[PDB]
Amino acid sequence: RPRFSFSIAAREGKARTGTIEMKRGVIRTPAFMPVGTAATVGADIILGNTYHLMLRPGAERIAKLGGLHSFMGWDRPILTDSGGYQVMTKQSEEGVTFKSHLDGSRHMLSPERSIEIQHLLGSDIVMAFDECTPYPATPSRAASSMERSMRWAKRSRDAFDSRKEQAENAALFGIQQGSVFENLRQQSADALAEIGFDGYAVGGLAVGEGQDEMFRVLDFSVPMLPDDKPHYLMGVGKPDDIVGAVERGIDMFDCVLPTRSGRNGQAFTWDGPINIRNARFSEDLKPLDSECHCAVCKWSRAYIHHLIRAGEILGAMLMTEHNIAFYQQLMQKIRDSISEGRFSQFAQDFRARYFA
Amino acid sequence: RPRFSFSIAAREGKARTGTIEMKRGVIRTPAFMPVGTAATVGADIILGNTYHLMLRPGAERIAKLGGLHSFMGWDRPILTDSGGYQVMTKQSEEGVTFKSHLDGSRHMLSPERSIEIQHLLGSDIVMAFDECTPYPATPSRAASSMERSMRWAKRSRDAFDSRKEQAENAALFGIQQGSVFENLRQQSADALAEIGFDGYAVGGLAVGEGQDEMFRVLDFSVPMLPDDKPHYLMGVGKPDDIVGAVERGIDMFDCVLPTRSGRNGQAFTWDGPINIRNARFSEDLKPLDSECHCAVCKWSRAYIHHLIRAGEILGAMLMTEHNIAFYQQLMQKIRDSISEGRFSQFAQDFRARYFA
Ligand SMILES: Nc1nc2c(CCc3ccccc3)c3nc[nH]c3cc2c(=O)[nH]1
Ligand SMILES: Nc1nc2c(CCc3ccccc3)c3nc[nH]c3cc2c(=O)[nH]1
Ligand SMILES: [Zn+2]
Ligand SMILES: [Zn+2]
């Protein structure tokens, strides 16, 4: 396999389905990328949590232990974020400084240090070091923030290219910013394409703007990115957010929801989310989702309800496994429907059932 | 398979190894019986938690859902306790009354109601309704308590025999009491044998007495029980407690330790218990136990350490899976060594390593 090759196998409207080939494995797109620590080692790529890892146990320590693949027992691709979003504290053109709440140790984050940390973690897809602009933002502040992120994007590119093992075996994604403003999104896309990256992320969304505004921003933002490269929407999202983002040309997704909801009693089903702790499930013998193929859907809603209400860790684990599996089944149905030219119909059918 | 058949295949000293045949499966002895809600569905029999189940969701509701086997997705034998130990509040010759902290509902427990609840749960091994005598106890109070438990044992026998489906398909164990007093233990054993049960439990231990006292009580108590029937030590115990109890003729065990320790960072290993949260494991690449065959022993001590320190539910789940698996590997090595006539040597080797 090559270091990085993205090929589009089928299209329907703005939606695409295809593959990213990397040395450690093939990623089927559109892809959902789950938190790597969420369950036992389906997903083609998992996330490492750069910000958490640089605090505990530290990037150098992870490298001493053989890198994240050996550490987590996962030999397929891993994507890491650049760490600044999670941090953001004192910011400047050099980077961000912050104090660890874990032990008071001081940490600097800069484009160069972010790339170095991700190199030490051994991730396969490295994110440029950006500034996630807060929402809402004025045009002036969004522009200043986006401009700093583009200078940091070039510094991330150079730092990545200066590490031969990283340049030859990993891939680097640039991150578009610009808040909700079309002209800043265009300026950011042009700056990123002039630098050149392996894939392009749409950053600065899933920050509280709501689905309508998010879709409006995707409508003009995704076409600004190189069509022949993967498009990664960071932090998105609920199942209906994912369907609509694929309809707007997104290829890759991550979201805290499947694992967070799995810890707070919420299960995703084709009939929408349910809170399994509710008394209405105490005698419900149907599996979590009727059509779900996951291992949990052996276990009834009644039993999972019981486990969670009883405080048993098994309950939260089964809920999390189901949610992660549901997201991957969603992505499989998206990929198959695009490939078969029936994605528009799938999206309509999905939304009628999910919101009924 | 018969309703109940216990056969002893080999002996070494007071230790025995063999099988209990029941309609739903064969139980290899000496057996460890794990909490059924502890992990996904090795163990030959699991425990139901009668006291918890009669409060949530209620025995009638479990029966409406098809009984515990269907509810928990476990088609092999299940043992249930009689519920009074866990309850013990107002006590009398009729039984015990108590108020549920969950919803203030009033509940009575009597020998008849305890047997009925266990019938509704559908368990395969039913415990007689006893009074677990507190420790320490005076001879007079231990005697009064033991005498009440023997009257309740006969009432449990009669209630069990009056339910044809239970009498024909389940088994009933009587529970020896008498605190630490040899003459009361003898009186209790004689009373139970005159009633007649399928197996005999040694109750009233693992209540704070310490291993020396527990072994002293087993030394004279286990020989009082019918030799050709299984001997169940309730609530025991740490791995070294189990080894010494097998050396004294016990066939069946249950204990909260594997799951409790799995939730508080403690892992059982052949080199003794370790607290995985300790910083000394942050860079330890060895699996939880070096010789352990469980699935966790793919994962290093360093990674499990990280997961638990990071608050990830996956960490507690892997710890619990390892501990349950370690207990079953312990029981397998006990059974094999007795069968091969090398159990005395195994016990010596186990204790030298476990306490080194
Ligand atoms: N670098 C960066 N990360 C974002 C994340 C975290 C994604 C991430 C990837 C991999 C691991 C953890 C987190 C966002 N989450 C929601 N909205 C987000 C926006 C951004 C953004 O603009 N920039
Ligand atoms: N009925 C009874 N139970 C006991 C338990 C719970 C065993 C149990 C079995 C199955 C499920 C839950 C609990 C004890 N636990 C520690 N020491 C114990 C003593 C007794 C006892 O004397 N009587
Ligand atoms: Zn499922
Ligand atoms: Zn193990």
PDB file of C-alpha atoms in Angstrom, chain B residues 245-333:
ATOM      1  CA  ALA B 245     -10.967 -24.372  51.497  1.00  0.00           C
ATOM      2  CA  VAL B 246     -10.564 -26.940  48.709  1.00  0.00           C
ATOM      3  CA  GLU B 247      -7.884 -28.585  50.864  1.00  0.00           C
ATOM      4  CA  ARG B 248     -10.624 -28.858  53.492  1.00  0.00           C
ATOM      5  CA  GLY B 249     -13.267 -30.424  51.228  1.00  0.00           C
ATOM      6  CA  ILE B 250     -15.183 -27.494  49.673  1.00  0.00           C
ATOM      7  CA  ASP B 251     -16.563 -27.926  46.122  1.00  0.00           C
ATOM      8  CA  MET B 252     -18.239 -24.582  45.308  1.00  0.00           C
ATOM      9  CA  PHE B 253     -17.379 -20.931  45.853  1.00  0.00           C
ATOM     10  CA  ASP B 254     -18.743 -17.446  45.309  1.00  0.00           C
ATOM     11  CA  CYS B 255     -17.140 -14.119  46.150  1.00  0.00           C
ATOM     12  CA  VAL B 256     -17.646 -10.403  45.533  1.00  0.00           C
ATOM     13  CA  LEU B 257     -13.875  -9.858  45.332  1.00  0.00           C
ATOM     14  CA  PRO B 258     -13.175 -10.417  41.589  1.00  0.00           C
ATOM     15  CA  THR B 259     -15.788  -7.857  40.512  1.00  0.00           C
ATOM     16  CA  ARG B 260     -15.323  -5.425  43.416  1.00  0.00           C
ATOM     17  CA  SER B 261     -11.541  -5.442  42.970  1.00  0.00           C
ATOM     18  CA  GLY B 262     -12.019  -5.078  39.212  1.00  0.00           C
ATOM     19  CA  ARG B 263     -13.873  -1.818  39.893  1.00  0.00           C
ATOM     20  CA  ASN B 264     -11.304  -0.466  42.394  1.00  0.00           C
ATOM     21  CA  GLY B 265      -8.121  -1.032  40.390  1.00  0.00           C
ATOM     22  CA  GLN B 266      -7.041  -4.368  41.883  1.00  0.00           C
ATOM     23  CA  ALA B 267      -6.032  -7.280  39.637  1.00  0.00           C
ATOM     24  CA  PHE B 268      -5.373 -10.824  40.794  1.00  0.00           C
ATOM     25  CA  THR B 269      -2.180 -12.418  39.444  1.00  0.00           C
ATOM     26  CA  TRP B 270      -0.198 -15.544  40.265  1.00  0.00           C
ATOM     27  CA  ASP B 271       2.268 -13.163  41.959  1.00  0.00           C
ATOM     28  CA  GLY B 272      -0.495 -11.790  44.183  1.00  0.00           C
ATOM     29  CA  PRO B 273      -2.864  -8.858  43.834  1.00  0.00           C
ATOM     30  CA  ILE B 274      -1.603  -5.650  42.230  1.00  0.00           C
ATOM     31  CA  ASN B 275      -3.191  -2.203  42.183  1.00  0.00           C
ATOM     32  CA  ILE B 276      -2.938  -1.290  38.518  1.00  0.00           C
ATOM     33  CA  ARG B 277      -3.477   2.424  39.224  1.00  0.00           C
ATOM     34  CA  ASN B 278      -0.105   2.645  40.971  1.00  0.00           C
ATOM     35  CA  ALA B 279       2.464   4.680  39.062  1.00  0.00           C
ATOM     36  CA  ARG B 280       4.820   1.669  38.977  1.00  0.00           C
ATOM     37  CA  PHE B 281       2.669   0.208  36.180  1.00  0.00           C
ATOM     38  CA  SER B 282       2.681   3.300  33.943  1.00  0.00           C
ATOM     39  CA  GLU B 283       5.466   1.857  31.759  1.00  0.00           C
ATOM     40  CA  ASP B 284       4.958  -1.873  32.467  1.00  0.00           C
ATOM     41  CA  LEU B 285       4.597  -3.654  29.108  1.00  0.00           C
ATOM     42  CA  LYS B 286       3.914  -7.081  30.607  1.00  0.00           C
ATOM     43  CA  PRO B 287       0.285  -8.238  30.382  1.00  0.00           C
ATOM     44  CA  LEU B 288      -1.752  -8.179  33.600  1.00  0.00           C
ATOM     45  CA  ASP B 289      -0.513 -11.678  34.442  1.00  0.00           C
ATOM     46  CA  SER B 290       2.383 -13.291  32.599  1.00  0.00           C
ATOM     47  CA  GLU B 291       0.911 -16.796  32.360  1.00  0.00           C
ATOM     48  CA  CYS B 292      -2.751 -15.774  32.083  1.00  0.00           C
ATOM     49  CA  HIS B 293      -4.556 -16.992  28.965  1.00  0.00           C
ATOM     50  CA  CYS B 294      -7.412 -14.470  29.136  1.00  0.00           C
ATOM     51  CA  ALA B 295      -8.049 -12.141  26.209  1.00  0.00           C
ATOM     52  CA  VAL B 296      -6.787  -9.155  28.213  1.00  0.00           C
ATOM     53  CA  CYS B 297      -3.442 -10.913  28.696  1.00  0.00           C
ATOM     54  CA  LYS B 298      -3.371  -8.378  24.010  1.00  0.00           C
ATOM     55  CA  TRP B 299      -3.247  -5.564  26.590  1.00  0.00           C
ATOM     56  CA  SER B 300      -0.342  -4.418  28.734  1.00  0.00           C
ATOM     57  CA  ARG B 301      -0.408  -3.352  32.361  1.00  0.00           C
ATOM     58  CA  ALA B 302       0.601   0.093  31.085  1.00  0.00           C
ATOM     59  CA  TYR B 303      -2.478   0.425  28.861  1.00  0.00           C
ATOM     60  CA  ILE B 304      -4.930  -0.860  31.491  1.00  0.00           C
ATOM     61  CA  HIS B 305      -3.280   1.499  33.983  1.00  0.00           C
ATOM     62  CA  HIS B 306      -3.831   4.345  31.516  1.00  0.00           C
ATOM     63  CA  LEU B 307      -7.479   3.466  30.877  1.00  0.00           C
ATOM     64  CA  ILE B 308      -8.385   3.329  34.543  1.00  0.00           C
ATOM     65  CA  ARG B 309      -6.464   6.494  35.430  1.00  0.00           C
ATOM     66  CA  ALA B 310      -8.263   8.179  32.528  1.00  0.00           C
ATOM     67  CA  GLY B 311     -11.668   7.112  33.866  1.00  0.00           C
ATOM     68  CA  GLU B 312     -12.472   4.987  30.804  1.00  0.00           C
ATOM     69  CA  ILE B 313     -15.103   2.305  31.376  1.00  0.00           C
ATOM     70  CA  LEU B 314     -13.098  -0.011  29.107  1.00  0.00           C
ATOM     71  CA  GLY B 315     -10.415  -0.109  31.799  1.00  0.00           C
ATOM     72  CA  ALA B 316     -12.717  -1.364  34.541  1.00  0.00           C
ATOM     73  CA  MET B 317     -14.266  -3.851  32.102  1.00  0.00           C
ATOM     74  CA  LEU B 318     -10.900  -5.352  31.139  1.00  0.00           C
ATOM     75  CA  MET B 319      -9.873  -5.531  34.797  1.00  0.00           C
ATOM     76  CA  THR B 320     -13.092  -7.346  35.676  1.00  0.00           C
ATOM     77  CA  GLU B 321     -12.771  -9.734  32.732  1.00  0.00           C
ATOM     78  CA  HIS B 322      -9.210 -10.516  33.770  1.00  0.00           C
ATOM     79  CA  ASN B 323     -10.135 -11.167  37.405  1.00  0.00           C
ATOM     80  CA  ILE B 324     -13.056 -13.447  36.513  1.00  0.00           C
ATOM     81  CA  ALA B 325     -10.818 -15.297  34.062  1.00  0.00           C
ATOM     82  CA  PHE B 326      -8.041 -15.572  36.649  1.00  0.00           C
ATOM     83  CA  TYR B 327     -10.457 -17.131  39.139  1.00  0.00           C
ATOM     84  CA  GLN B 328     -11.593 -19.663  36.531  1.00  0.00           C
ATOM     85  CA  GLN B 329      -7.996 -20.487  35.603  1.00  0.00           C
ATOM     86  CA  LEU B 330      -7.319 -21.007  39.316  1.00  0.00           C
ATOM     87  CA  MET B 331     -10.269 -23.404  39.510  1.00  0.00           C
ATOM     88  CA  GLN B 332      -9.107 -25.282  36.413  1.00  0.00           C
ATOM     89  CA  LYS B 333      -5.615 -25.728  37.872  1.00  0.00           C
TER      90      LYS B 333
END
